[PDB]
Amino acid sequence: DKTVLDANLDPLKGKTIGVIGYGNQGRVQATIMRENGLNVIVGNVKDKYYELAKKEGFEVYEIDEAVRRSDVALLLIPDEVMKEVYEKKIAPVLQGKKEFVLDFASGYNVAFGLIRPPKSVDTIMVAPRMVGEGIMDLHKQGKGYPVLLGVKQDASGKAWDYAKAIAKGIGAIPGGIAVISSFEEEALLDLMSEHTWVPILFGAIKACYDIAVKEYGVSPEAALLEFYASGELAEIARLIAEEGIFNQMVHHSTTSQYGTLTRMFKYYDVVRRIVENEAKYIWDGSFAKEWSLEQQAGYPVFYRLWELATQSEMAKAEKELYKLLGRK
Amino acid sequence: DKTVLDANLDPLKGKTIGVIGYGNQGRVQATIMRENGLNVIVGNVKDKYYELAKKEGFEVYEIDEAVRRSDVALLLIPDEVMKEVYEKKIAPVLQGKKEFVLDFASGYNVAFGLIRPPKSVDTIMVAPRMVGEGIMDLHKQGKGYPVLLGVKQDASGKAWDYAKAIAKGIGAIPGGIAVISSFEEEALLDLMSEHTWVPILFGAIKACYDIAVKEYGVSPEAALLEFYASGELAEIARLIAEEGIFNQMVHHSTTSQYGTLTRMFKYYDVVRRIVENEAKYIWDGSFAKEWSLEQQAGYPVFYRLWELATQSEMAKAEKELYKLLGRK
Amino acid sequence: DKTVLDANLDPLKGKTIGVIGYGNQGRVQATIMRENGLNVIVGNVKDKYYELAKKEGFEVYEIDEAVRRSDVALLLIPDEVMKEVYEKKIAPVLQGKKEFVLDFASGYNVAFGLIRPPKSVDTIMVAPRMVGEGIMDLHKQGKGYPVLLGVKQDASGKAWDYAKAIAKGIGAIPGGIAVISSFEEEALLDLMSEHTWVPILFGAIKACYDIAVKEYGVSPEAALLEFYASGELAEIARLIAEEGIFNQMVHHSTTSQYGTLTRMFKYYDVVRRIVENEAKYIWDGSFAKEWSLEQQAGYPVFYRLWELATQSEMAKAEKELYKLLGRK
Amino acid sequence: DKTVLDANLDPLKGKTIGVIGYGNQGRVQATIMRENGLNVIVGNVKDKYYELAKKEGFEVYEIDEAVRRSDVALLLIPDEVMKEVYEKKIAPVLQGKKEFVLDFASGYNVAFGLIRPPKSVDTIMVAPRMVGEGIMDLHKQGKGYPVLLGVKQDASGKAWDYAKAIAKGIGAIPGGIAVISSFEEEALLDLMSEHTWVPILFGAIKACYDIAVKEYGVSPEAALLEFYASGELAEIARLIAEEGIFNQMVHHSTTSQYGTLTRMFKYYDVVRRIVENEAKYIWDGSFAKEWSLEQQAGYPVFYRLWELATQSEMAKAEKELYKLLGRK
Ligand SMILES: NC(=O)C1=CN([C@@H]2O[C@H](COP(=O)(O)OP(=O)(O)OC[C@H]3O[C@@H](n4cnc5c(N)ncnc54)[C@H](O)[C@@H]3O)[C@@H](O)[C@H]2O)C=CC1
Ligand SMILES: NC(=O)C1=CN([C@@H]2O[C@H](COP(=O)(O)OP(=O)(O)OC[C@H]3O[C@@H](n4cnc5c(N)ncnc54)[C@H](O)[C@@H]3O)[C@@H](O)[C@H]2O)C=CC1
Ligand SMILES: NC(=O)C1=CN([C@@H]2O[C@H](COP(=O)(O)OP(=O)(O)OC[C@H]3O[C@@H](n4cnc5c(N)ncnc54)[C@H](O)[C@@H]3O)[C@@H](O)[C@H]2O)C=CC1
Ligand SMILES: NC(=O)C1=CN([C@@H]2O[C@H](COP(=O)(O)OP(=O)(O)OC[C@H]3O[C@@H](n4cnc5c(N)ncnc54)[C@H](O)[C@@H]3O)[C@@H](O)[C@H]2O)C=CC1
Ligand SMILES: O=C(O)C1(C(=O)O)CC1
Ligand SMILES: O=C(O)C1(C(=O)O)CC1
Ligand SMILES: O=C(O)C1(C(=O)O)CC1
Ligand SMILES: O=C(O)C1(C(=O)O)CC1
Ligand SMILES: [Mg+2]
Ligand SMILES: [Mg+2]
Ligand SMILES: [Mg+2]
Ligand SMILES: [Mg+2]
Ligand SMILES: [Mg+2]
Ligand SMILES: [Mg+2]
Ligand SMILES: [Mg+2]
Ligand SMILES: [Mg+2]
């Protein structure tokens, strides 16, 4: 209905694509755009990555020289230091440009207003949904994969066609799909998943273990095998990915289905509440402030929590165990 | 009783007044002090404003050169960037001075400790209560207007006479009045008005509209005419300004007076509570911290809220309407 | 979309329009209908107003004689004594009529069932949204202005065309607009504005003053200048009327915008609650009962509240002040 | 300090005093003013009272004829029907007057706005504090007694001297005293005593009896003797009147003093709350509305409560008892 499946590849010919960063996403996006018939250069600071990106053939300059040559740029770099870079190097050059297309992999720095490029620029988003590595395995098979798209500002009337051109340039289509959206509807999710259903999982596990041991008299080496020290989790995750979330449960016995569904519908509101709270905290722009300040202070809380979890009890016992199974 | 009406104009003769900034307040204060028989220079950075302030005759240097020549300075500039300026340019020069008089239009940066000048300085406040423009219309008529005054530090024994000298130098007296106060009793109000009775007004309106439409089946184009899209508001505001707040209501019918007064006395405590909370939040110095940090982060929340209100529903409908009345 | 801009002026020719009352709305409506080519008479009791309405040329009889001659009547009189009049004089005459058109400026007496005319009558509403005076200034410029319309009962199939005919007869269109609605959706608003966002404003102000003085040690003569004794209010009301409610705030500094918006979104629910309560109190018809009874008792509460507010503290100090600025 | 003890008796000579009503207060006030050297007439409707007031020498006309002759009037009649009378008869005559002095015994009808005389009238209050009868016994002894005074409106500059003239005209001074006050501070008390400490007394007694009987197994004929069927109450009331409220308790044993004082200080707040609530209910003007409406409906609730209390249990048993002691 609203899930674009393919487009043309016209605009990006006659132009040069200067890519920034050569990390996880950078490598594959670069190689794919190259293999699909596009001229490319690369921009990165002179470190270990520089040698490699040079190795694979790309003609590499440093950043400003790169943006100066391209009418397009893929800012494939972290979500934290982008601000400093944009303010030190790029913007001075942006003002020196006429028509320029800016693409990101994440809108955390845009949606929340931390960047405000000129009006003479085409602003867009291209959001892969993958770890980054397996994309290669999915590529050699010729299969595409999903992505999200959106615009924040356009002064050329043709932002979307450039967006889809790139969508093809990375091979995620055809074969996969590409959704159209906004920056907000992307960061919102990328953070909701991180704030709501993941940490709750971790806490539930950490609590079941502690309860069992300290109250019902269980041995530590036992629980961990049942809870996560076995591959059960990833197996059922795969069943979800392929066969469906709910239809998955048939492979389990009824005695499991009943106890699962009853509770699922029993403890639903309790977490809906939490999700509402957190989503509202985000939509307003608070979390960005929180994180930015913690950056401006020295990552104290980060430090203390990383010390606690690792120096917790469950982690100690798990270390003993892994030490016992021959693993790391 | 304690509302000074006029004083003498002695101290500021034989001295030079170097004014900083030439914005809204700067223009009129400058012109008035000039027309009342005082030598003046002007201090501003080389931008658009510089050309104009030069146009109107004032001999303009840049800031440091200005403060170096005057025994007095009127820091008529925003309430946010004053800190950076004072720390970069002025203080080095303050230490080079012997007797200097510092005047402001707002004490937000002083009362909350963000500035701490030397002990060899006369610190004062002069607070006009006007938009800035209409002061001219009130001046040509020869009428004064009200102001607030106060001191934070004095090492000359004669701060108040300089204060009143200036009070005359801007023409707000005689004809108007001048109150004596402190910096705190000024910022406190300038912020209470912004935090308590204004936003409550806006929220009440925004809520009445939403309720009417979404629940009682009203058309959007209708409400806005009753609530604020008509000039009712400013009319009664004027009646308040001139004839009195309460006596104003006679012009309205009784059926309005009853329903207004009963509720006024019904919902009084509810807002007294809020006002207490906010005033306490201020007196302590929290809001200053909040705002300063939000400045040090990139105005995220500012951004998101400005996006919400504008992209709300009421604003959309109002835009359609104004588009329909031929206005902007 | 649903905002009529003009119609024809056919039905009201060959007929006579007998107007009742000659107060604020009566004068201008009368003069305009006369200047747009319509025969008119006037109905009022023999008091001061009678002499004037006669002065301006209108051939005046007393009421019953007027309704007897016209097929239309504009009941431009208060919202309180209309009942007594309708029951004493008009209804006896209504029964003597064949086809008659009844128009009001407010539906408080209709929507709430206090009047129930025959079935042989055309019932309509015409609701100007103005103080009444400025309409003249808006008329000489040829500009129209907004109004609300609606029907309660029709036995002629052509109520709406008479409504629009009148809409033109008063000059509010063209140039302005005219909305279509019901009686309820009119009184509801005319009362919500009086019950919710006005008295809350007054109470917030009255509370800020009291708090400041009695707790934080401020002088009375000071606050009033900041809160309402200055023309700030009407200025920003005008900015709302013209440039938009929210876009208005740009002229203020950021430090104001932040503190305003955060709170606006913080204290929203608190007042939504109140608005719901009051709107429900109205929709049901309670307030009408309350007011009618208080009329049948002698306006005691009215009396006591008017004594309190005037004999309050804030009003005393404001009287001293106005006495000090040379105003009344 | 502020307790007038005597004044002169000048103004009321050369003038005629027309008194209204001849009930409890009327008789003694009339006779006293006559015995102190003043001309008097009387105003009352033609009923039983008329014959008597004529008997005692007073030259009696009916009301309007009376007010027409006097420059003063004492409206010694109930607090309920005064409105009807004032509106039917007096006001038409008031407008026919030049200088007139209006005195009352209670301000319930004034303070609460139920009467609004012209501006050409001297309005005052004179409030005896007595049953009405014992005043005679206190008069023959030559002793005065206390009263309250106040003004609501004066257009003669000499209201207070007329007030004190009357204060002497009724003999309550000298020997007694006269306080100066307002109408509000009079009705407020006359109603607080009726609403707070009296009914609480009655309820406490009614509850002790019921509790004792229905729970602790006591006979009805017993309790009533202890609680109120004995003269204990009036005895200690007299001790209060004469020797002091607290010093009274010495005559009782310590075992009583302890249990009384501890509880007095234990249950203090509980009733302070109630008193606040009721006083606020009054100050606002609600009770007046309540009562007026109940008058306009037919005294239903009055009826039902009078039926309940009388047809209660305690009253039945008390009737049996009084029937047993030979009393009524
Ligand atoms: N698994 C993943 O990491 C995925 C990445 N993304 C998005 O792509 C971007 C990052 O992806 P990757 O680069 O592949 O992961 P990454 O975290 O390994 O990125 C490291 C790269 O950042 C560059 N870099 C780091 N610090 C720099 C600095 N101060 N100055 C200049 N360059 C610096 C380095 O050249 C390095 O190659 C983010 O926006 C992320 O949201 C989206 C899907 C998942
Ligand atoms: N309607 C108003 O704006 C009123 C102003 N005030 C107070 O006066 C001061 C501001 O008044 P206005 O200047 O008339 O309004 P404004 O906001 O238009 O001030 C703009 C002026 O600030 C100068 N300026 C801005 N940024 C600068 C920077 N980085 N470096 C050097 N100069 C800079 C500019 O020369 C410009 O002329 C504030 O303290 C305010 O509280 C008091 C009453 C109301
Ligand atoms: N600013 C305003 O007053 C506006 C008026 N309206 C509506 O129009 C009507 C009133 O408007 P206006 O007359 O202009 O204001 P108004 O309150 O000055 O009306 C006074 C008129 O009512 C007449 N009148 C008063 N008592 C009377 C009585 N016992 N018997 C016969 N006639 C009596 C008088 O002739 C007098 O001319 C109301 O329905 C009101 O809701 C609508 C918009 C605003
Ligand atoms: N124990 C008391 O009754 C005291 C009386 N007062 C105040 O004095 C006034 C009443 O005092 P009293 O007359 O002595 O008690 P009251 O209740 O016995 O008054 C009865 C008198 O009212 C007259 N009256 C009753 N209905 C009338 C009507 N429709 N039209 C014309 N006249 C009518 C009658 O002539 C009758 O003589 C009240 O304002 C009361 O607050 C003050 C202190 C106590
Ligand atoms: O792993 C589980 O939870 C099983 C169950 O008892 O349902 C064994 C399959
Ligand atoms: O604007 C209002 O609220 C009015 C009322 O009904 O009281 C018309 C004057
Ligand atoms: O400080 C502020 O934002 C101002 C106000 O009037 O509230 C403009 C001076
Ligand atoms: O009447 C009482 O309450 C007494 C007591 O026991 O204190 C007998 C005096
Ligand atoms: Mg993420
Ligand atoms: Mg994710
Ligand atoms: Mg401010
Ligand atoms: Mg202000
Ligand atoms: Mg109204
Ligand atoms: Mg209104
Ligand atoms: Mg009483
Ligand atoms: Mg009493």
Q: Shortest Cα distance from B216 to chain A (angstroms)?
A: 27
Put simply, the answer to whether D296 touches C299 (Cβ < 8 Å) is no
Residue at which a domain ends, from D181, D212, D237: D181
Q: What residues of B are in contact with residue A114 (Cβ under 8 Å)?
A: 298, 300
User: Cα(B288)–Cα(C255) distance, rounded to whole angstroms?
Assistant: 10
User: Cα(D26)–Cα(D22) distance, rounded to whole angstroms?
Assistant: 4
Q: Indicate if C152 and C218 belong to the same structural domain.
A: no
Residues contacting residue D285 through CB under 8 Å, at least 6 positions apart: C300, C301, C303, C304, C305, D112, D113
Q: What residues of D are in contact with residue C298 (Cβ under 8 Å)?
A: 83, 112-114, 292
Ordered DSSP codes for B276-309: HHHHHHHHTTHHHHHHHHHHHHTSHHHHHHHHHH
What's the token pair of residue C281?
A: 């109190």
The radius of gyration computed from the CA coordinates of chain C, to the nearest angstrom, equals 23
Q: Indicate if D49 and D14 belong to the same structural domain.
A: yes
Q: Is A104 helix (H, G, I), strand (E, B) or coil?
A: strand
User: For chain D, where are the E strands, in sequence order?
Assistant: 3-4, 17-20, 40-43, 59-61, 72-75, 100-104, 121-128, 147-153, 178-180
Nearest to D284 among C298, C299, C301 (CB): C301
Q: Indicate if D154 and D58 belong to the same structural domain.
A: yes
Q: Indicate if D161 and D192 belong to the same structural domain.
A: no
Residue at which a domain ends, from C130, C156, C181: C181
Q: Indicate if D221 and D167 belong to the same structural domain.
A: no
Q: What residues of C are in contact with residue B327 (Cβ under 8 Å)?
A: 242
Q: Which ligand is nearest to the CA of A249?
A: 5
**CB A268: neighbour CB atoms within 10 A?**
10
Q: Indicate if C172 and C221 belong to the same structural domain.
A: no
Residue of B nearest to C3 (CA): B221
Nearest to B238 among C216, C234, C278 (CB): C234
Q: What residues of B are in contact with residue C272 (Cβ under 8 Å)?
A: 203, 207, 210-211
Q: What residues of C are in contact with residue D291 (Cβ under 8 Å)?
A: none
Residue of C nearest to D281 (CA): C301
Residues contacting residue B229 through CB under 8 Å, at least 6 positions apart: B318, B321, C146, C241
Query: Does ligand 5 lie within 6 Å of residue A254's CB atom?
Result: no
The H or E element spanning position C227 is helix C220-227
Distance from the CA of A287 to the center of ligand 1, in angstroms? Answer: 21
Q: Indicate if D192 and D323 belong to the same structural domain.
A: yes
Q: Assess whether chains B and C touch, using the rule of 3 or more C-beta pairs within 8 angstroms.
A: yes
Residues contacting residue C23 through CB under 8 Å, at least 6 positions apart: C49, C76, C77
Q: Indicate if D278 and D171 belong to the same structural domain.
A: no
Q: Indicate if A170 and A195 belong to the same structural domain.
A: no
Nearest to C294 among B80, B238, B258 (CB): B258
Put simply, the answer to whether A293 touches B297 (Cβ < 8 Å) is yes
Residue type, C112: F
Q: Which atom of ligand 8 is nearest to the CA of D255?
A: 7
Domain housing D71: 1-181
Strands B40-43 and C147-153: unpaired
Query: Does ligand 1 lie within 6 Å of residue A105's CB atom?
Result: yes
Q: Indicate if C18 and C160 belong to the same structural domain.
A: yes
Q: Which contacts of B31-40 are long-range, i.e. CB under 8 A and separated by 24 or more positions?
A: B31/B56, B32/B139, B32/B169, B32/B170, B32/B171, B33/B169, B33/B170, B34/B58, B36/B9, B36/B168, B36/B169, B36/B171, B37/B13, B38/B12, B38/B13, B38/B169, B39/B15, B40/B16
Looking up residue B5, the CATH number of its domain turns out to be 3.40.50.720
Q: A103: annotated binding-site residue?
A: no
Interface of B with A (CB under 8 A): 293-294, 296-305
B-contacting chains (≥3 CB pairs under 8 Å): A, C
Distance from the CA of B298 to the center of ligand 10, in angstroms? Answer: 25
Distance from the CA of B233 to the center of ligand 14, in angstroms? Answer: 10
Q: C233, B237 in Cβ contact below 8 A?
A: yes
User: Cα(B273)–Cα(A314) distance, rounded to whole angstroms?
Assistant: 48
Q: At A174, give phi and psi (nearest 5°).
A: -80, 180
Residue type, B144: G
Method of determination is cryo-EM
Q: Assess whether chains C and D touch, using the rule of 3 or more C-beta pairs within 8 angstroms.
A: yes
Per the annotation, binding residues of C for Mg(2+) are: 190, 194
Put simply, the answer to whether D285 touches C293 (Cβ < 8 Å) is no
Gaps in chain D with C–N over 2.5 Å, residue before each: none
Distance from the CA of D170 to the center of ligand 12, in angstroms? Answer: 60
Query: Does ligand 4 lie within 6 Å of residue D21's CB atom?
Result: yes
Residue at which a domain ends, from D115, D148, D181: D181
The H or E element spanning position C49 is helix C48-55
Q: Indicate if B94 and B213 belong to the same structural domain.
A: no
How many structural domains are present in chain C? 2
* Bridge partners for B40 per DSSP: B17
Put simply, the answer to whether B197 touches C216 (Cβ < 8 Å) is no
Q: What residues of D are in contact with residue C305 (Cβ under 8 Å)?
A: 284-285
Query: Please, where are the H alpha helices in chain B?
Result: 24-35, 48-55, 63-69, 82-85, 91-94, 108-111, 134-140, 159-169, 184-192, 198-216, 220-227, 232-243, 254-266, 269-283, 286-297, 300-310, 313-324
Indicate the DSSP class of residue C90.
Answer: I
Nearest to C275 among B196, B202, B211 (CB): B211
For ligand 11, an ion, list residues with CB under 5 A.
B 190
* Bridge partners for B149 per DSSP: B126, B180
Residue of B nearest to C130 (CA): B232
Residues contacting residue B9 through CB under 8 Å, at least 6 positions apart: B36, B165, B168, B169
Q: Indicate if B157 and B242 belong to the same structural domain.
A: no
Nearest C-alpha neighbor of C63 from the set C82, C38, C39 = C82
Distance from the CA of A76 to the center of ligand 3, in angstroms? Answer: 71
Query: Does ligand 5 lie within 6 Å of residue A253's CB atom?
Result: yes
Q: Among all chains, which residue has been given the structure tokens 């047993």?
A: D324
Distance from the CA of A284 to the center of ligand 9, in angstroms? Answer: 17
User: Cα(C70)–Cα(D189) distance, rounded to whole angstroms?
Assistant: 59
Strands A121-128 and A147-153: antiparallel
